[PDB]
């Protein structure tokens, strides 16, 4: 790959510079290069990988939603025919988004997940796998939509099982996994009751464990707990 000639440490350094510069495509390319060196990632490095690709796919997802809404309106009664352009451009953005998701899933499969033994790494990567299958599911409409959804569910479920056995209820990775799996239930799997139940149980079990934490850990956990609460308020 184009990062093959750059030192691992230099790729990490440049990923951090790219973040400061809000150059998220560069950040993601540097982190992909770092992963492709073949060594496991540290906690900080995993976080950089996640931030870089989330910012990239987030721009694509926002654009896709804008274009899909225009396309949906164009297909309403009384809307004037304007040609193939809206569909074409929505498809262009869609294909690019799918390519980014496939790239992330490919890094996870070759070979981050299989070498991840500690709960903090394995849950993190399995959550990411769920997230990027979820983004694929958001745009899927063909014979494989059900399989894409089930791939997201399967990754999230394995992550959930490990997190419940190996992490405290306030662990931020555990909390963020639960938050995102709950969003999956609500928005992808047509299971709002499961989404609400998961968010509630997660929030309550975290509340009960806050007393064990330092001030800094408390701040980290309560931040994500507030996101759970925000979704519960939206959904109920």
């Amino acid at each position: 790959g184009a990062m093959g000639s750059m030192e691992r440490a230099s790729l990490i350094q440049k990923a951090k510079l790219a973040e400061q510069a809000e150059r998220y495509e560069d950040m993601a390319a540097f982190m992909k290069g770092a992963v492709e060196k073949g060594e496991e990632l540290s906690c900080e490095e995993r976080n950089l990988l996640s931030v870089a690709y989330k910012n990239v796919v987030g721009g694509q997802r926002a654009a896709w939603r804008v274009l899909s809404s225009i396309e949906q309106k164009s297909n309403e009664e009384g809307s004037e025919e304007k040609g193939p352009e809206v569909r074409e451009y929505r498809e262009k953005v869609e294909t690019e988004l799918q390519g980014v998701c496939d790239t992330v899933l490919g890094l996870l499969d070759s070979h981050l997940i299989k070498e991840a033994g500690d709960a903090e790494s394995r849950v993190f990567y399995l959550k990411m796998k769920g997230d990027y299958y979820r983004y694929l599911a958001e745009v899927a409409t063909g014979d494989d939509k059900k399989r894409i959804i089930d791939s997201a569910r399967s990754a999230y479920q394995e992550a959930m099982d490990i997190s419940k056995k190996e992490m405290p209820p306030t662990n931020p990775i555990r909390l963020g996994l639960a938050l995102n799996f709950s969003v999956f239930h609500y928005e992808i799997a047509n299971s709002p009751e499961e989404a609400i139940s998961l968010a509630k149980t997660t929030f309550d079990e975290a509340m009960a464990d806050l007393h064990t934490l330092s001030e800094d850990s408390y701040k980290d956990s309560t931040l994500i707990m507030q996101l759970l609460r925000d979704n519960l308020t939206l959904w109920t």
Partner: peptide, 9 residues
């Protein structure tokens, strides 16, 4: 619509 984590910056 719903909040997930990480989010966009």
């Amino acid at each position: 619509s719903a909040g997930s984590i990480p989010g966009r910056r």
